[PDB]
Amino acid sequence: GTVNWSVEDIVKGINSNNLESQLQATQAARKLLSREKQPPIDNIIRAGLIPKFVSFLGKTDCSPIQFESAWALTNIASGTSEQTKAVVDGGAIPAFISLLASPHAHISEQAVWALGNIAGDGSAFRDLVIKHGAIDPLLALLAVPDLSTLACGYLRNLTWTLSNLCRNKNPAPPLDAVEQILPTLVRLLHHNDPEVLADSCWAISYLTDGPNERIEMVVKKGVVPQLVKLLGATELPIVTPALRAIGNIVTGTDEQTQKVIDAGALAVFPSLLTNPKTNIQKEATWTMSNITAGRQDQIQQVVNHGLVPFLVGVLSKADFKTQKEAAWAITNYTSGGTVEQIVYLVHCGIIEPLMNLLSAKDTKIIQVILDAISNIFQAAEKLGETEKLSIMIEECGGLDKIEALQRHENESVYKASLNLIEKYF
Amino acid sequence: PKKRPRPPKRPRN
């Protein structure tokens, strides 16, 4: 009935003075913009229909046209920043925030969806949606004794829109808004729907990606144990944002990193550091590098959980970026660790892969590996076993690497290599 | 030892 309409017919129907003809034309526009294959968003915009849809959003007497217009504008705001800006310029933000209070659940759901698309464009439209006062009705939609009584799709769309209101930086979301949203985020983080859990973990990862003050706002709510529990989840869509948030949290203070450790996160890294997905391995190794850059008792906790063998393994075989993160972890371990801990590191078989990685075409990992080498040699000097070490490095073909690096382009590279071969070989 | 650093829109179909 309203399928395969032309934009000219849609315009002719919406420009009529017949609410039913306008409704049919708006539904035709919705069906047109709901097509997976090249929806004619720009044609609809050029036609000048966004203002008419935004006006229809306010016709409470005709809820069907409200729903159809919300759907159409949602799909126009789902595209480019210019198309989302066209939606916003029509005055759709306050209209959607008003629709949030609709007695019809499908209309309020579509308004949540549209506002999520608008806030996901970037920090500017996000903060504008917040200034128009969307957070209060959004959270009110979730003010129920048990979230399980809400419809699955409804709760998922609300969780995702809230995640987008926590998303993007430069600037990060307003502090008062984050404080307003966090308790509902904790509630959702304790929900049982994997989609809700994944979106809530993404929201927490967004909120934790920044200065230690934001990380502290998050950690004070006590979500770290639940983040670790979800880190042990089987659904990768959940593990990814959980690991991202844990890593973000360990980028901060030693006390926040210790909060992460106390929740039992390390017990999960034996799997994360051998995870078949390369992104998970890289994120876990980067988190491990930021943990090895912490206090000595935290390095000792890393040792106790048997994670040094896993770092050795990742260094021996893994995607090169994960190997670079592992080299950073090793250098931090050797820079902040004790002599006993560095001796343990050597006894775990770090030297051979550390040497083998010195033949890479990335100067930075070369510098990192050479710095770790120097630290291990210093710890050996404190024991008088420098010679034994030197012999190990020679036996695995490392001295050849350092000598060939003496003739390298970068300055600090050949400087450190020459220092090594002069002071120990 | 230093700590280092490292769907926005959805259509309804």
Numbering used by the authors:
A (entry chain A): 72 to 496
B (entry chain B): 135 to 140, 150 to 156
List passages from the publication reporting this PDB structure.
IMPα recognizes three types of cNLSs via two binding sites: the major binding site accommodates monopartite cNLSs, the minor binding site recognizes atypical cNLSs, while bipartite cNLSs simultaneously interact with both major and minor sites. We combined bioinformatic, biochemical, functional, and structural approaches to study this phenomenon, using polyomaviruses (PyVs) large tumor antigens (LTAs) as a model.
The linkers between the two stretches of basic aas range from 11 aas in MWPyV to 32 aas in HPyV12. Strikingly, all other tested cNLS peptides bound as bipartite cNLSs (NLSbip), occupying both the minor and major binding sites of IMPα2ΔIBB with their upstream and downstream basic clusters, respectively. For all bipartite cNLSs, the IMPα2ΔIBB P2 major site pocket is occupied by a K residue, forming hydrogen bonds with IMPα2ΔIBB residues and a salt bridge with D192, whereas the P2’ minor site pocket is occupied by an R residue, forming hydrogen bonds with IMPα2ΔIBB residues and a salt bridge with E396. In the case of MWPyV LTA‐GFP, substitution of key basic residues either in the upstream, downstream, or both monopartite cNLSs completely abolished nuclear targeting. This implies that despite MWPyV LTA possessing two monopartite cNLSs which are functional when fused to a heterologous protein, they only function as a bipartite cNLS in a more physiological context. Such a scenario is exemplified by MWPyV and WUPyV LTAs, whose two cNLSs are still functional independent of each other, but together act as a bipartite cNLS. The lowest Kd for JCPyV and WUPyV LTA cNLSs was measured with IMPα1ΔIBB, for KIPyV and WUPyV LTA cNLSs was with IMPα7ΔIBB, and for MWPyV LTA cNLSs was with IMPα2ΔIBB.
